[PDB]
Amino acid sequence: QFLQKFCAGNPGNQALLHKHLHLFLTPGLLEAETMQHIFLNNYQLCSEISEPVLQHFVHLLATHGRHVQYLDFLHTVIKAEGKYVKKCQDMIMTELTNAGDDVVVFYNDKASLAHLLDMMKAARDGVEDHSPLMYHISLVDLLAACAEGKNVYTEIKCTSLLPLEDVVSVVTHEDCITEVKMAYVNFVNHCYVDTEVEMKEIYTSNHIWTLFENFTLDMARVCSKREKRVADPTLEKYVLSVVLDTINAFFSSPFSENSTSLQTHQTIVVQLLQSTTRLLECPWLQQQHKGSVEACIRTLAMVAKGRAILLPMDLDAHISSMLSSGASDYKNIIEKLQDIITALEERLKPLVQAELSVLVDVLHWPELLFLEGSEAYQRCESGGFLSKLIQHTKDLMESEEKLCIKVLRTLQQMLLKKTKYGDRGNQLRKMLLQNYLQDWSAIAATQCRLDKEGATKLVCDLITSTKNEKIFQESIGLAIHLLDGGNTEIQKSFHNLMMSDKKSERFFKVLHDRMKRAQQETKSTVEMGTSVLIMQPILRFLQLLCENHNRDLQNFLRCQNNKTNYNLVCETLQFLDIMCGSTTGGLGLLGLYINEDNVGLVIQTLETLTEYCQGPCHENQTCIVTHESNGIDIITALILNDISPLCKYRMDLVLQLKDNASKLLLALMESRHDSENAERILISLRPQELVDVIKKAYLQEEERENSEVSPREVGHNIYILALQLSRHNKQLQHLLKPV
Amino acid sequence: SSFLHIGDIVSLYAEGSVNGFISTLGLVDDRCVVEPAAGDLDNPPKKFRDCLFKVCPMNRYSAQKQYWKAKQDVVLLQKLQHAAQMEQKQNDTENKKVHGDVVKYGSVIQLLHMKSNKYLTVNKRLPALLEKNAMRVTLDATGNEGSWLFIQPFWKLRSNGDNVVVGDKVILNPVNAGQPLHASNYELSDNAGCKEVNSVNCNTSWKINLFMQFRDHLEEVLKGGDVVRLFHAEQEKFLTCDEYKGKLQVFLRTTLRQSATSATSSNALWEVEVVHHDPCRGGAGHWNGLYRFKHLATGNYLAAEENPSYEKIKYCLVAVPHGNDIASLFELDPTTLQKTDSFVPRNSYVRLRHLCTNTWIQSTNVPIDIEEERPIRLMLGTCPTKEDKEAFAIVSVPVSEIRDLDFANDASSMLASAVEKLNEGFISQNDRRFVIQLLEDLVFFVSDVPNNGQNVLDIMVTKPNRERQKLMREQNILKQVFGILKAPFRPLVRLEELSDQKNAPYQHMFRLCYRVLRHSQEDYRKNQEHIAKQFGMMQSQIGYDILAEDTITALLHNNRKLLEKHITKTEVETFVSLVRKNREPRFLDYLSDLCVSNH
Amino acid sequence: QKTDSFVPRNSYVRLRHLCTNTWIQSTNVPIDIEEERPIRLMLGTCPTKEDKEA
Numbered sequence A: 001q002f003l004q005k006f007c008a009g010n011p012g013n014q015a016l017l018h019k020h021l022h023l024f025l026t027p028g029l030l031e032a033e034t035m036q037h038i039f040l041n042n043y044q045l046c047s048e049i050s051e052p053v054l055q056h057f058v059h060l061l062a063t064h065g066r067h068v069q070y071l072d073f074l075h076t077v078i079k080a081e082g083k084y085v086k087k088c089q090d091m092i093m094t095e096l097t098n099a100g101d102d103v104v105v106f107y108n109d110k111a112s113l114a115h116l117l118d119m120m121k122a123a124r125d126g127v128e129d130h131s132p133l134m135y136h137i138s139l140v141d142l143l144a145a146c147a148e149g150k151n152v153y154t155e156i157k158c159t160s161l162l163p164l165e166d167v168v169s170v171v172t173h174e175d176c177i178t179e180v181k182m183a184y185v186n187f188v189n190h191c192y193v194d195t196e197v198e199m200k201e202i203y204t205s206n207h208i209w210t211l212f213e214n215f216t217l218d219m220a221r222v223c224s225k226r227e228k229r230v231a232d233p234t235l236e237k238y239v240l241s242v243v244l245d246t247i248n249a250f251f252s253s254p255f256s257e258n259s260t261s262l263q264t265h266q267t268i269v270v271q272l273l274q275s276t277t278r279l280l281e282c283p284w285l286q287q288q289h290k291g292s293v294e295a296c297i298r299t300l301a302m303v304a305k306g307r308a309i310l311l312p313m314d315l316d317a318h319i320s321s322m323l324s325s326g327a328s329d330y331k332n333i334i335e336k337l338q339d340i341i342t343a344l345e346e347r348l349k350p351l352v353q354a355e356l357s358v359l360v361d362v363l364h365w366p367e368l369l370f371l372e373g374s375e376a377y378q379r380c381e382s383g384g385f386l387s388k389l390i391q392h393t394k395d396l397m398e399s400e401e402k403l404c405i406k407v408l409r410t411l412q413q414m415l416l417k418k419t420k421y422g423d424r425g426n427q428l429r430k431m432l433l434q435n436y437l438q439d440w441s442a443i444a445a446t447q448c449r450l451d452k453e454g455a456t457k458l459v460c461d462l463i464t465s466t467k468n469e470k471i472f473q474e475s476i477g478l479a480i481h482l483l484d485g486g487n488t489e490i491q492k493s494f495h496n497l498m499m500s501d502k503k504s505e506r507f508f509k510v511l512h513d514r515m516k517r518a519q520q521e522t523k524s525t526v527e528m529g530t531s532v533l534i535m536q537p538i539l540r541f542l543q544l545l546c547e548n549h550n551r552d553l554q555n556f557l558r559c560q561n562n563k564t565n566y567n568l569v570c571e572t573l574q575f576l577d578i579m580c581g582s583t584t585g586g587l588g589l590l591g592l593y594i595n596e597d598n599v600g601l602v603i604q605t606l607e608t609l610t611e612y613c614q615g616p617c618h619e620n621q622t623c624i625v626t627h628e629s630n631g632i633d634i635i636t637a638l639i640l641n642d643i644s645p646l647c648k649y650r651m652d653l654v655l656q657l658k659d660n661a662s663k664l665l666l667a668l669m670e671s672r673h674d675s676e677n678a679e680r681i682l683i684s685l686r687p688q689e690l691v692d693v694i695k696k697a698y699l700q701e702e703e704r705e706n707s708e709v710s711p712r713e714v715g716h717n718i719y720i721l722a723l724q725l726s727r728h729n730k731q732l733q734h735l736l737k738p739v
Numbered sequence B: 001s002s003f004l005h006i007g008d009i010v011s012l013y014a015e016g017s018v019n020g021f022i023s024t025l026g027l028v029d030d031r032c033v034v035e036p037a038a039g040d041l042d043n044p045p046k047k048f049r050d051c052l053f054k055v056c057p058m059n060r061y062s063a064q065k066q067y068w069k070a071k072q073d074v075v076l077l078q079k080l081q082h083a084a085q086m087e088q089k090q091n092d093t094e095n096k097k098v099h100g101d102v103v104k105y106g107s108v109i110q111l112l113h114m115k116s117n118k119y120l121t122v123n124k125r126l127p128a129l130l131e132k133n134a135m136r137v138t139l140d141a142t143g144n145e146g147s148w149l150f151i152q153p154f155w156k157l158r159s160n161g162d163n164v165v166v167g168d169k170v171i172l173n174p175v176n177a178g179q180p181l182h183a184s185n186y187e188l189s190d191n192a193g194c195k196e197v198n199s200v201n202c203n204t205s206w207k208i209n210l211f212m213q214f215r216d217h218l219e220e221v222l223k224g225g226d227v228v229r230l231f232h233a234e235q236e237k238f239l240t241c242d243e244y245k246g247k248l249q250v251f252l253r254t255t256l257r258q259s260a261t262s263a264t265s266s267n268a269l270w271e272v273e274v275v276h277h278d279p280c281r282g283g284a285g286h287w288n289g290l291y292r293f294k295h296l297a298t299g300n301y302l303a304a305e306e307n308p309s310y311e312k313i314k315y316c317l318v319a320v321p322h323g324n325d326i327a328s329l330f331e332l333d334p335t336t337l338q339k340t341d342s343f344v345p346r347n348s349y350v351r352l353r354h355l356c357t358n359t360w361i362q363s364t365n366v367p368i369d370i371e372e373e374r375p376i377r378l379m380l381g382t383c384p385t386k387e388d389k390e391a392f393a394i395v396s397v398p399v400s401e402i403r404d405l406d407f408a409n410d411a412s413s414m415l416a417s418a419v420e421k422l423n424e425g426f427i428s429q430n431d432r433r434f435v436i437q438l439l440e441d442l443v444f445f446v447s448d449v450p451n452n453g454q455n456v457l458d459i460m461v462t463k464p465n466r467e468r469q470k471l472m473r474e475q476n477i478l479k480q481v482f483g484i485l486k487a488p489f490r491p492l493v494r495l496e497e498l499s500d501q502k503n504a505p506y507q508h509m510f511r512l513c514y515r516v517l518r519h520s521q522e523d524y525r526k527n528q529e530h531i532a533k534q535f536g537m538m539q540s541q542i543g544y545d546i547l548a549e550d551t552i553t554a555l556l557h558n559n560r561k562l563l564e565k566h567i568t569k570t571e572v573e574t575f576v577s578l579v580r581k582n583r584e585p586r587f588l589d590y591l592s593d594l595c596v597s598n599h
Numbered sequence C: 001q002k003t004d005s006f007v008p009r010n011s012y013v014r015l016r017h018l019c020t021n022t023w024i025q026s027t028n029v030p031i032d033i034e035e036e037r038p039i040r041l042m043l044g045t046c047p048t049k050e051d052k053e054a
């Protein structure tokens, strides 16, 4: 109990107690309640909740029996601070389905219905704290919450478990308890009215009207109860929240256009409308509930006018009137302490950066620390501290994650250009440097020093074998920084490493599968997903590796010499095709998909593709042009089709994209003397549209004021491509000539 | 054994909870069922045409999906349509290029039903009819992304990257559903003994047998399971089998048409089956081989039996239901010289020889219906000696005619079942609804107009169809409709009681039947005469809200002969009497139309 | 396999007895039934051929 009190309402204490979770990961109701309090009202831990915990609790429920504590824990885990977790919902539903009928029990049978009635009448006054009825209610609520997510299979399974016949038989029964009514109404609202199924039996069934008339009877009971001071909070809250919610959801969907056909349905609608009118007339209704009631009444009114139902004139004028009406020293010491704290934090901002800078510098020159002529000084002169640091970084990859991350980060800052932090920061750095120690050329020299030291081996061993996303990202950044500037020696060392190394396929395998997951996430999606963000570093790393027209590296990337061969260029083309929408985008719908968020990634992908093609490389050119996915068309669609959404409020990006696409096409046809490339590109490129966009670029040049890339060179590049293409197209040659 | 090349025709066994070939119901039904009672691997089902699937490569439907959404601004729609057309043509080009390649475990394949020409697609956004938790599996002609299926190894012997071998067991996992196909144990209410195939987690193994190779699927060959007609060159007549006096008889029909080849009838359609060691294997037929002939209309096998007249001939041809006897095996001999023993070319004259009795088929000039005016049936019998002049050309039939015949045969079967049920005197609401659905479907089929949700008792047709009308008449469907119209008034329902709501559905049913009797009699004289043969029944029921008067007027609208025969004092008196009762202008209009015909 | 060539290594095969014309097969009957945690499974030959057993 004390632990529950201590970890309630404060995320910090909740996480601190959750750190020692091995104590509560054991059978016991009290432990389950305590851990439920630990994972209550917080989203960080719930989102990152490990699958084994849920699996163990499901197995516990299956083995030790049915209890409500575990169901309550699952319900709390599903919803955190008002936002559901898709992952947790998925694992919970899968585990429940795989558990079997023992864990999940539904009283949908005649005998089971009689048992439900017996349990209900046994708890007529109120639901007991622990009883099978509570377990059923909790299970129904959990299933409804899980079905709230957008998963078709889960909704189908929920519908199969509880057919509409069961809910009408139980809810509409002569005697029904409030808890079951609320749970079943919520289940219907979150599993029947709102679904991705096309059949949607609810919208084309008379059962929902039976539910509606039952709800009207319930509201009549509520009003009569208050008239006689027999107010029941459960009935009031049920009618106020769930009855109105389900009524609004059913009557607001656009698929109920033809549902209202029977005059009896119209009478039920009138009864519901006057029911809401009676509800708003009384002053007991609360302001927050008044808003929901008014909204439901509005929706019902739009439905009524749309159906042109002839309501009674007196109440019809009444509903019109309502529609028009609604339309219309201790504290002082604390604050002073906070002020001083923020002031000190602002003041000390540059000094810390200077201290990290001196750390990097000291690491760069460890020899000065020792004395001249000492054996340790000789060791540091030729490698030494840096060699041991790099060598041991791989060893401590698993022992300490934070230490490895920090070592990689400081190594990255070592290769970065120097910068000034300020007068005070510079002075502090000078003092620390003197006390402790007594252009592109420098960056290249440092990169070569790391190359000799063994940095390439460290980074390669990190990418090939690392289960931590942060370490992989830092390793990729280190590779980028080492390759920055198109060094011709780091690339050679990297190529030697891949060619002569037992791992071989492992590094390319992790790169390849990461790219595959990236395209899968992009396809599923259509901010940005975590999977797509990591794609920019990988593309930049590949482009830098193949920079300066390194033929051997391009050939190796296209196809390795190992037993298992993985290509990265074709995956890059496929990824661009998927991101751009494929055929549908190239047809003219490309502009809709492209937005400001993903423009930079597309630019980087195009840059990498043109770097692959350049050199020139024939094999890469044939692979890209003759790809199975037919991605090349999108490259053409970039220049032919103007991005209607982005062009209105962002032009520089559009011109940059067009320029990159033109460069990529020119690189594809840099030294192609055959005709297959010409025919393939011409199929997508309509000559008339090509010349038209050429003229459009000329006349559009006027906007050079706000764009650093002038439309003139993009137009000129397109014309150069047209000249290269006209060699195999007589019509294009004729059109390309001047008037 | 051999690899499963793309294009081969296979049969998918359903070993697991329920074992049986995955067949599909006829008509517009898009439901696939595995029926274990029909047969097993050793004994195949009698109707071995609904269990054949062709394996096809990947087919992209992105632009097609977008076009469908656009259908369910004009320049954009036109561009999308052009996109769908170019994407389709790219699809066929890729399919032709990839044809002949082997299939590997973990690859992507689509199953196309040869009979229905519909892909076996799986829909994840709909639950199954009988198993809610299981997602839908149905046949779609155009296909969608659900048609994609991974073939995976049910055995540990085969791994990803290996080549599939015929006769093995595999698992079919749809690309989107991610749930293997399962043959549930939920029997379908509509058809007894038929289970349901749904995409859901299970452990069923789909043993992939082999029926035809990719190389043997050439259209220039007489392939096993093909359907052809046996034209007689000397007598210029088509071989036919028909019900005559309670027993089916095989004969040579005579026609008065100037061109004998134009006497095309659905009863003369025969299917050729190559007898191989494997019961479930067909393939191209060779000159040195044994063949069997099946009748699509009735499912009977041609054979020879002792002739009581033993006339000059010893045995006579006859239809036999069973096909496992040795009396149904026939060898085909060529009439010209052929290079070695190669595949039998299509549209080539051949001679049929019986294996058991070593006798050669021969025509005879003795009519069987001697007690009938204008004999049209000529007896056929086998003579021990060989006659060179007697050869039977094997003429191919267009696939369309087969499709209409398959549509009509099942419909006739269920109409006959409904007629028998009505004759018994008991019927259920579900059965009545099913028969109503059948009647409207038949109306649409006869009209041939696409279904746009118009009134069932109101449809416009510009060009009546002749071949469909002939198929409608000669499959006894019109006779079954007449039985449906006549049997109820014999009493389950009464004419005056049709107004009452209790019998309201029956009245509607009858209207449909009358409409079924209206489209058939349009520009075709034989159908008009056949329907008019029972003019008494239509006259008896005229007056009630059954549309009998409209059918009669249409029947006699153009044909003068029936106009004089079926119009006399009595019927005009009945028209006057019902005019006096109803006092409605429509009957006056009908009389005015009857007054003058053909302007 | 192409013709009758050498048996490749690491290849699945089925064993058949010459004398009795029977095919080897696994069985789910432990031999040490009088012993906790049976680990030995009986093997026997069935006249019919099972493809899954390799």
Ligand SMILES: O=P(O)(O)O[C@@H]1[C@H](O)[C@H](O)[C@@H](OP(=O)(O)O)[C@H](OP(=O)(O)O)[C@H]1O
Binding pocket: B254, B255, B256, B257, B263, B470, B525, B526
């Ligand atoms: O041109 P008309 O006046 O209609 O007459 C045609 C023909 O003279 C026969 O009556 C009949 O052929 P059969 O000798 O085979 O009966 C044919 O129908 P068919 O299409 O059923 O052959 C008719 O269409």
